Amino acid sequence: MSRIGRLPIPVPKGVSVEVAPGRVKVKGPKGELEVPVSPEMRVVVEEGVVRVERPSDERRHKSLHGLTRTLIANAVKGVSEGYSKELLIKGIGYRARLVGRALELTVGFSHPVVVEPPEGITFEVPEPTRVRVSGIDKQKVGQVAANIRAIRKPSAYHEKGIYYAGEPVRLKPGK
Amino acid sequence: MKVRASVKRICDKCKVIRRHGRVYVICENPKHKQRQG
Amino acid sequence: XXXXXXXXXXXXXXXXXXXXXXXXXXXXXXXXXXXXXXXXXXXXXXXXXXXXXXXXXXXXXXXXXXXXXXXXXXXXXXXXXLXXXXXXXXXXXXXXXXXXXXXXXXXXXXXXXXXXXXXXXXXXXXXXXX
Amino acid sequence: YRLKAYYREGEKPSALRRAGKLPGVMYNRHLNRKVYVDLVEFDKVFRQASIHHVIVLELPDGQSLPTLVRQVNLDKRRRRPEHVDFFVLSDEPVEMYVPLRFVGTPAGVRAGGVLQEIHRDILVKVSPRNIPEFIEVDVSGLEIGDSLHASDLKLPPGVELAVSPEETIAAVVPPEDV
Amino acid sequence: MLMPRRMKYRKQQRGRLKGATKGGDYVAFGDYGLVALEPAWITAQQIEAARVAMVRHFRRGGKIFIRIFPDKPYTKKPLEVRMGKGKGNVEGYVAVVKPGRVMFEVAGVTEEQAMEALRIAGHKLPIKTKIVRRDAYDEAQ
RNA sequence: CUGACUGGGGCCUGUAGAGCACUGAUAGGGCUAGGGGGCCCACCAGCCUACCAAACCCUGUCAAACUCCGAAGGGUCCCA
RNA sequence: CAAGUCUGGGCUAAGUGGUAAAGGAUGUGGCGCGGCGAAGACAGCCAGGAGGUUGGCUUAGAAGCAGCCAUCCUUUAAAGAGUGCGUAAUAGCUCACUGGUCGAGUGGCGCCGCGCCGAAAAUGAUCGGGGCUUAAGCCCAGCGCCGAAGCUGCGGGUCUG
RNA sequence: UGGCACCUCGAUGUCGGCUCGUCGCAUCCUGGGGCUGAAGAAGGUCCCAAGGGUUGGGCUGUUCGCCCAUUAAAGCGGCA
Ligand SMILES: [Mg+2]
Ligand SMILES: [Mg+2]
Ligand SMILES: [Mg+2]
Ligand SMILES: [Mg+2]
Ligand SMILES: [Mg+2]
Ligand SMILES: [Mg+2]
Ligand SMILES: [Mg+2]
Ligand SMILES: [Mg+2]
Ligand SMILES: [Mg+2]
Ligand SMILES: [Mg+2]
Ligand SMILES: [Mg+2]
Ligand SMILES: [Mg+2]
Ligand SMILES: [Mg+2]
Ligand SMILES: [Mg+2]
Ligand SMILES: [Mg+2]
Ligand SMILES: [Mg+2]
Ligand SMILES: [Mg+2]
Ligand SMILES: [Mg+2]
Ligand SMILES: [Mg+2]
Ligand SMILES: [Mg+2]
Ligand SMILES: [Mg+2]
Ligand SMILES: [Mg+2]
Ligand SMILES: [Zn+2]
C-alpha cells in the first residue's frame, strides 16, 4: 500500500504553483496549464514540493487523494516538454507529409485526410514512416492521438495501422 | 461473447469493470468480452 | 522470522567466517552456462562455498548480531544477494572470479567479500591474488 | 477442552441465544444443572474436538467438569445448534463413540472404491483412565469382490470391545462408470 | 426415470409444505451434501437431470448418493378439458422436500471437484440449495 | 339466575407434530432359500462369483385412506 | 392537506424508494476466522527461470501442455513429469517456486443491511401530483401535534327497567 | 387454443375484404457498433435505434398459407 500523494513532488527547474482558491494554475518555461481541484481537499503550495491533504476516509477522499496529486504530477513534467508520444504508421505506400500544421496523410482513402490540429499541438514529422505528436499537456496530446486513431483501425488481419508504440498482437490469418 | 444475464470469468485473465452502471468484462482477445444486460 | 528460522539457521550457523559476500547475478555476466560458470568453483574447489542465500539484510541482521558483521557492501544500491562459506576462499579466488567473472559482459566479480574471520576488499576481491 | 460455563435459572433463552449463547445441561448421575456456553468457543473447539475427546468445562464454583456431547440439535433450515446436552463422566465405564479412521491403499488405488461407511464406529465403553484419543484401522488389500471387514477383526487395544453387535462396518462399493 | 412399482392407492392429495425438516439434515453417508432451503417438489425429471449431471461430470471414481424418493403422483388433467369430471391422469411421481433437508450426497470426490459438481447439479433444481460439507454436527453421543 | 362466556375438577378423541412396532414403497451395506448357472468335477467330492436374487439384520427414509406414540384445542357433566 | 423541514445513531447514490423471480458481479457499510509483515508483507521492475528428461510401441507425435503409468529425484541462492498460450510435433512467450534498491499493511472467506443487471406491448407519462439525496427514502428509538358521526362538556326527544 | 363465468338476454351486430389510420419493438430493410469458424463481397449472431417505407398478381369466402416477376424489404402484433 502506498496512496499516491504519500511521496512528494520535488521538481528541478522549479515551476510556479499558485493558490487559485478552487483550482491549480501551473506556469512553466513553455506553457501554463489548469487542474481542477475538489474544494474540500486541501493541496498546499509549500517550498519545493506541492503537498496534498485529505480530511477523512470514504469513497471520495480516498480516490480524490491521488486524482488531485497525479493530475498535478502530469503538469510537473508537462510544462517542461516531457512528452514525445510517437505515432509510427505502417503501410505499403502510406506516408504523412506536412504543410504548416494541418497534417494531410494518405491512409488508403480516395482523398488525403486533412488533420486540423487544435491550439498548442505540434505535429513533428521526422520520417514519412513515423510522426510524433507533441505539446504541453498530456490530455491534449492523448486526445489528438486518439483522433489520429479515429481514421484508421489497426489489426485487421494484416498491417496498415497505428499502435502508439508498435504492438502487433493482431490475430491469425484467414488465408 | 456478447450481452448475457450471467457473467463468469472464462480464461482467468479477465478483468471485471463496472462502468456507467452496468458490468463489462474484458481481456486481450475481444471474443471473450461480456456485457451484463 | 515466523516461518524462516531453519532456513536462516542454514546460513547463520556455519557462517562464522564467510567468504564470497560479493554480487550475485546483476544482469551483466550472470552464469549463462549452467554447468561450470553458474556454480563457478564446482569445476575446481567443489561445492562448499556456493552460497545458500535468502538474505541480504534479513538473516544478515542475524549475522550482524551473532558474531561480528563479516563485511558491508550492498545495502542501498542494487547488487542482489551473494553468500558463501570457505572452501577455497584465499586459495582459488581468482579462479572463482574467473568463472564468476571470466566472461559475462566484463568482470562482474564480487563487491566486498570476506576472508577468514575478517573482511575483504573490492580491489582485493576483483583484482586480488587472495 | 477448556470451555467456560455459567448458570441458568429458568430464563427466556430463545431470546438469550441471539448473541451466540446457546443453552445446555450437564450430568453424570444427578445434578441436572442448566448452563449456557458460547457459540464461537464451542463451535471453534467443536471444529476438531469431536465426540471422542473429553471436553472439560470450567465452572464459577472452581470445578473442571470432564464432559462430552450427547446430542447437537440441528436448526433444520438454519444449520445451527439450539441446545447441546453435556455429559459429565464419573467413576464409571461410560459409553463413548470414537471416530476411528482408515489408512492405507483402499482397494488397490486405481481399482479403488469409496469406503464411506464411517458411522462413528458404533460403540465402545471405557473407564475414564483408559479412554483413547485415536485408534487406527488399516485398509490393506481389500479389493472389490472379497476382503470385507465384518467386525470380526475388531479387537481394540484394551477397554472395551463392541458390546452386542458385530454387523455395522465399512465395505467396498463399485465406482460410477459412464 | 424411476417410479415406485407398487402402491396401496394410485392417486393421492397435495397437502401443505409447512414444517421444518422431519428428518434428513445430518449427512451420515458422504463427505458433502446438497441441502435445500425452499419448499417445493422434486419431479423424477429433476432427479434424472441432476443424476446424469454427476456421472457425466466426474468419471472413474466417486459414488453418487441420492436420498430422495418420489411417492407422490403429480395429477394433471388433459389439455382443453373443462373442470370437474374427476381427477386427471398421473404423469410423473414427485417427491416432497422440506427446507434444510440434504438431497444429493457425493462420495469419493474432493473439495474443488465436489463444490463444482454440486454447483452444476444445483442449477438443475428450482430450489435455493446451498452446499454443506462433512462437519462435526452428527447426532452421535 | 338457569343463558353467551369465564374459573376449579374429571371423561373422550386419534388431527397437527413425531415414529416404523403394524399396512405398503423405499437410497445403500452385510448375510445368501435358491435360480441363466455352475471354472466345469466318477455330481454333489468343491471353488470365487467381479451373474441374478428370496428371506433376515443395520445406516437411512415417505404416507389422506399406517399408528408403538401423541398435544395445543373442542365437546360434555358438577360447583362458582 | 390539518399537523415537526423535530431531536439522536447509522444506512442508501439506484430515483432503489415509487414493478417480480432463477442466476451473476473489487457496489458499498458492519461482525468473526486464517496466512503474511517493518528477521522488509501484496501488486510491481529486473533475474542463469533448470540437469536425468523428446522418461516409455504411446497409431502418424507426444519435448509440461489430445488422451495413458503411479507419480519421481538430484544439482540450487528458488523451480514440475509443469499456469496459460503458441506449434501437426518442434522451437518460443509466460511461469507456479524465489534474490533486491523500495514500502506498512496485504489476500481467501462465512454471515449480514441497502443496492445494480436480469426488467421489452400496443391513446400521454408520472410514487395521488409537484417535488425529495447528512432526506421530504430505509432500520432502531424518544417528545409532541394533526387526525371520525368513537369517547367525554352541555342541551333536547324517545324506549326499557 | 384454453379454464373461470364478473357488467352485457328490455340484444354490446359475428368472419373476411375496400377506404381510413394510430401505437409498441421483441427490427424485414435503410442508420451506427462488438464478435465470428469476419482474406474482400455476400454472410451468421447480438446491442442501440419505430424516423420513413413494407409491391403488382394467380388460387380459395377466406385471416393464414402455396406459387410468378421484382425490390433493400414484401416484419410481428394491439387498437371490441
Ligand atoms: Mg350457575
Ligand atoms: Mg353451559
Ligand atoms: Mg374453561
Ligand atoms: Mg395421521
Ligand atoms: Mg404429518
Ligand atoms: Mg383437556
Ligand atoms: Mg402546515
Ligand atoms: Mg425490484
Ligand atoms: Mg439522520
Ligand atoms: Mg356515542
Ligand atoms: Mg346527554
Ligand atoms: Mg381468454
Ligand atoms: Mg359463482
Ligand atoms: Mg337499453
Ligand atoms: Mg352479439
Ligand atoms: Mg349475433
Ligand atoms: Mg432493441
Ligand atoms: Mg431478435
Ligand atoms: Mg446494419
Ligand atoms: Mg465483410
Ligand atoms: Mg412512429
Ligand atoms: Mg412504422
Ligand atoms: Zn480472461
Side-chain angles (χ1 to χ4, degrees):
Chain A
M1 177 178 173
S2 71
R3 296 291 177 267
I4 307 300
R6 297 291 179 88
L7 58 93
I9 304 299
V11 46
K13 188 66 70 177
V15 303
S16 296
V17 177
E18 289 84 4
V19 177
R23 288 174 287 112
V24 173
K25 295 186 286 185
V26 175
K27 273 78 70 177
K30 300 294 188 291
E32 67 272 14
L33 293 179
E34 185 70 30
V35 173
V37 176
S38 66
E40 53 88 18
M41 187 173 290
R42 184 176 178 179
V43 288
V44 199
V45 288
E46 291 90 353
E47 295 177 353
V49 299
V50 177
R51 296 290 178 89
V52 54
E53 183 68 29
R54 60 176 178 85
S56 178
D57 288 329
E58 69 268 18
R59 299 295 297 163
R60 63 184 69 187
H61 291 177
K62 195 173 179 64
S63 298
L64 269 295
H65 180 74
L67 188 148
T68 308
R69 189 262 176 192
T70 311
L71 270 71
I72 298 301
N74 296 115
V76 170
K77 66 185 288 185
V79 297
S80 65
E81 294 293 328
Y83 294 101
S84 65
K85 300 286 103 176
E86 71 273 14
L87 291 174
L88 73 165
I89 56 97
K90 299 295 189 293
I92 303 299
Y94 289 173
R95 64 180 64 88
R97 69 266 186 98
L98 180 62
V99 177
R101 277 84 64 194
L103 181 64
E104 70 270 16
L105 75 163
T106 61
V107 292
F109 289 163
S110 297
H111 182 73
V113 176
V114 283
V115 174
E116 192 271 331
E119 192 271 332
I121 300 299
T122 299
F123 288 160
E124 288 289 327
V125 182
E127 292 292 327
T129 61
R130 61 178 177 87
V131 301
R132 65 180 65 251
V133 175
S134 179
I136 297 96
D137 197 75
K138 190 175 182 179
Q139 183 71 41
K140 293 180 181 179
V141 176
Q143 184 67 40
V144 174
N147 292 119
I148 302 299
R149 174 58 60 87
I151 294 100
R152 178 62 64 192
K153 192 259 186 294
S155 297
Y157 289 99
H158 61 275
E159 296 296 326
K160 298 184 284 290
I162 59 171
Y163 299 97
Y164 295 103
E167 187 69 29
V169 197
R170 296 172 287 112
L171 59 98
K172 294 181 184 292
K175 277 78 177 175
Chain B
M1 287 183 281
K2 197 61 180 175
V3 181
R4 294 178 68 248
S6 177
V7 170
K8 292 180 175 65
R9 294 178 67 188
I10 311 165
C11 67
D12 56 355
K13 298 294 187 291
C14 287
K15 285 186 260 73
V16 181
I17 302 299
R18 183 259 181 88
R19 68 188 73 184
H20 296 89
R22 75 275 295 151
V23 176
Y24 299 178
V25 165
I26 46 94
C27 295
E28 192 272 330
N29 45 0
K31 67 183 289 184
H32 291 170
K33 66 185 291 182
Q34 297 177 0
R35 184 177 75 87
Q36 189 173 6
Chain C
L82 183 64
Chain D
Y1 57 93
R2 277 85 61 88
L3 273 74
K4 299 291 180 68
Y6 292 100
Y7 286 162
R8 289 191 292 115
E9 291 85 3
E11 289 86 3
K12 300 285 102 175
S14 66
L16 293 175
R17 64 187 297 275
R18 58 98 178 266
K21 295 185 289 293
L22 58 91
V25 62
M26 77 289 198
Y27 53 90
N28 52 4
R29 182 68 180 271
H30 56 87
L31 288 173
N32 297 114
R33 298 294 296 163
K34 292 186 286 185
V35 299
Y36 66 95
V37 297
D38 190 74
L39 191 145
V40 71
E41 293 179 354
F42 180 73
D43 196 2
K44 182 174 73 175
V45 176
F46 198 71
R47 292 293 91 193
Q48 188 64 42
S50 296
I51 300 99
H52 64 277
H53 183 73
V54 177
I55 174 170
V56 292
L57 187 67
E58 288 85 4
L59 199 283
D61 291 331
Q63 63 183 357
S64 66
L65 294 175
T67 63
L68 72 153
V69 63
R70 295 288 92 191
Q71 62 183 357
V72 176
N73 297 114
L74 296 173
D75 207 86
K76 291 183 182 294
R77 78 184 166 88
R78 276 90 170 90
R79 190 69 177 173
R80 287 184 290 113
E82 288 97 0
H83 187 276
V84 177
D85 194 1
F86 289 160
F87 185 75
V88 183
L89 58 89
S90 177
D91 49 357
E92 184 69 27
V94 298
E95 296 292 327
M96 292 301 294
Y97 296 178
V98 176
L100 287 74
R101 71 184 68 189
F102 302 98
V103 75
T105 171
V109 288
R110 173 59 63 191
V114 175
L115 273 297
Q116 72 274 15
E117 186 70 29
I118 297 169
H119 73 273
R120 281 86 173 94
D121 300 314
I122 45 174
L123 74 162
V124 277
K125 64 183 181 181
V126 73
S127 66
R129 295 292 184 269
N130 202 0
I131 182 164
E133 185 178 1
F134 179 73
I135 304 168
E136 181 266 329
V137 177
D138 54 353
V139 288
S140 65
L142 299 181
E143 67 95 19
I144 294 97
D146 57 353
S147 295
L148 295 173
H149 194 278
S151 179
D152 196 2
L153 51 99
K154 189 66 177 177
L155 296 173
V159 165
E160 288 292 327
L161 279 74
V163 181
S164 179
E166 63 270 14
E167 54 91 19
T168 300
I169 204 65
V172 178
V173 296
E176 292 292 327
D177 291 331
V178 299
Chain E
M1 284 74 74
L2 60 93
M3 70 285 198
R5 63 182 180 179
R6 295 182 68 250
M7 293 183 288
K8 293 189 287 184
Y9 297 101
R10 292 185 292 115
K11 301 179 180 68
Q12 67 182 357
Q13 292 179 354
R14 294 179 179 90
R16 291 183 63 87
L17 296 176
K18 65 183 180 181
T21 304
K22 196 251 182 65
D25 198 1
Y26 59 93
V27 176
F29 291 100
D31 53 355
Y32 298 104
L34 183 64
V35 60
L37 291 174
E38 291 179 353
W41 285 352
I42 305 299
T43 68
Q45 285 74 241
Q46 293 177 0
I47 298 168
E48 186 71 27
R51 187 179 63 85
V52 172
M54 289 296 182
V55 65
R56 297 292 183 184
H57 189 195
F58 61 93
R59 292 187 294 273
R60 191 67 184 273
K63 183 174 174 66
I64 189 63
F65 288 158
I66 56 99
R67 293 180 67 248
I68 54 174
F69 183 74
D71 54 354
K72 186 179 263 77
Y74 179 75
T75 300
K76 184 178 184 293
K77 291 182 72 67
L79 294 174
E80 296 177 355
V81 178
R82 291 181 183 270
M83 294 299 292
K85 277 78 176 175
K87 290 177 70 67
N89 296 114
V90 176
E91 290 86 3
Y93 300 97
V94 304
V96 56
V97 291
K98 299 293 179 68
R101 187 175 182 271
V102 180
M103 296 184 287
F104 295 99
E105 293 174 351
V106 299
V109 184
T110 61
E111 180 69 28
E112 291 86 4
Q113 192 174 5
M115 292 300 108
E116 185 69 27
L118 289 169
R119 191 183 67 84
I120 298 305
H123 293 285
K124 298 293 190 292
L125 278 305
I127 297 97
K128 293 182 185 293
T129 61
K130 65 184 289 185
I131 296 97
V132 293
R133 71 266 184 98
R134 174 63 67 191
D135 292 331
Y137 287 163
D138 54 352
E139 296 292 328
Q141 67 269 18

